[PDB]
Structure 1
Amino acid sequence: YNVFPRTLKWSKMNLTYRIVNYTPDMTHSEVEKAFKKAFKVWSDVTPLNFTRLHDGIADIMISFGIKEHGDFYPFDGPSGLLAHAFPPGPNYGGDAHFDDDETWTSSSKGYNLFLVAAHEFGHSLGLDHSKDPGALMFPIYTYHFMLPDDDVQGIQSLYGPGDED
């Protein structure tokens, strides 16, 4: 027999993601670079591996959308809600949605897609919010990034450290 796991997490270390569509604000390359970097934040401190799928069903389906876009968490136009992601699980579990009424950037302007995506993928992997004000998972946006210690401690609690050197 098997009882359900203690915590919500992926039962496998090899995870796929798919960029379903793209924002007007950045090139395909810029969007791809930002998400690859944001996944690397987490894979660097765990045994998790992330591979991009161009089509088909991936574990973490990424999309840009506005207002009602197919779930119980409609977006709200510019500012306010920037994005959201669902905890590990089947179907919409793990998926990350970005509000395309925001201006997404690879820089300090608008909202940095990398930074917001890194926070989102924290959710996709099983982290909720932190009370550590320096944490990536501290639910307030601010802008060489290094994953703060609270976030490392949190993610490793779920997946272990993987290779430590």
Structure 2
Amino acid sequence: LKWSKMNLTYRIVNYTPDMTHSEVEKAFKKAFKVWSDVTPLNFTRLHDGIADIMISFGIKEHGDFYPFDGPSGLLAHAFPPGPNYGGDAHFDDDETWTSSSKGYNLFLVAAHEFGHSLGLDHSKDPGALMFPIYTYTGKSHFMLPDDDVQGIQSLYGPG
């Protein structure tokens, strides 16, 4: 199961008080770039209306009955490709989101989350972005692990 459309659209519904609007827009745009760079997927940011992937920040009960645990623990959850809720990614605003390392790097979490949005299962490869354990190298460049490039491309193809 995956996206019928190669051209997806996302909308940053709201923001975290931890980062500036640019900081968040850069994090997500860099996050989609991770996947688009290795597939035919295109991501267009939508300011208003319905978007294939609605990005939102919320705490505890936020409208889906998968409540966030608050500070630490669960950080974010995303729904697979599909209508309505599908593609959507929520970020536990009870977490300290960051561009660097102080708390939880948004770009890193968003990339993993968009993996789920594009249909990527959690990986078993300890060195894969889709591996369900948060790790941050601190490096100022991101390489998509081969596990991820393979998994995503097994869905939408390379170039």
User: In the TM superposition, what is the alpha-carbon distance from 1:10 to its structure 2 partner?
Assistant: 0.3
Q: Describe the superposition over 1:28-70 as per-residue Cα deviations: whole angstroms up to 9, x where unpaired.
A: 0000000000000000000000000001000000000000001
Task: State how far apart, in whole Å, the 1-side matches of 2:80 and 2:98 are.
Answer: 25
TM-score by length of 1: 0.93
Q: Does 1:106 align with 2:104?
A: no
Q: Does 1:79 align with 2:72?
A: yes
TM-score by length of 2: 0.97
Secondary structure of 1:34's match? helix
Task: State how far apart, in whole Å, the 2-side matches of 1:14 and 1:51 are.
Answer: 8
Task: State how far apart, in whole Å, the 2-side matches of 1:68 and 1:100 are.
Answer: 11
Matches for 1:101-140 after TM superposition, within 5 Å: 101-140=94-133
Task: State how far apart, in whole Å, the 1-side matches of 2:50 and 2:109 are.
Answer: 23
Structure 1: which 5+ runs fail to align?
1-7
User: In the TM superposition, what is the alpha-carbon distance from 1:109 to its structure 2 partner?
Assistant: 1.2
User: In the TM superposition, what is the alpha-carbon distance from 1:72 to its structure 2 partner?
Assistant: 2.1
Q: Describe the superposition over 1:115-144 as per-residue Cα deviations: whole angstroms up to 9, x where unpaired.
A: 000000000000011110000001000001
RMSD: 0.4
Secondary structure of 2:72's match? coil
Task: State how far apart, in whole Å, the 2-side matches of 1:79 and 1:109 are.
Answer: 13
User: In the TM superposition, what is the alpha-carbon distance from 1:108 to its structure 2 partner?
Assistant: 1.1
Query: How many residues align structurally?
Result: 155
- Residue 155 of structure 2 is matched in structure 1 by 158
Runs of 4+ in 1 over 6 A off after TM superposition: none
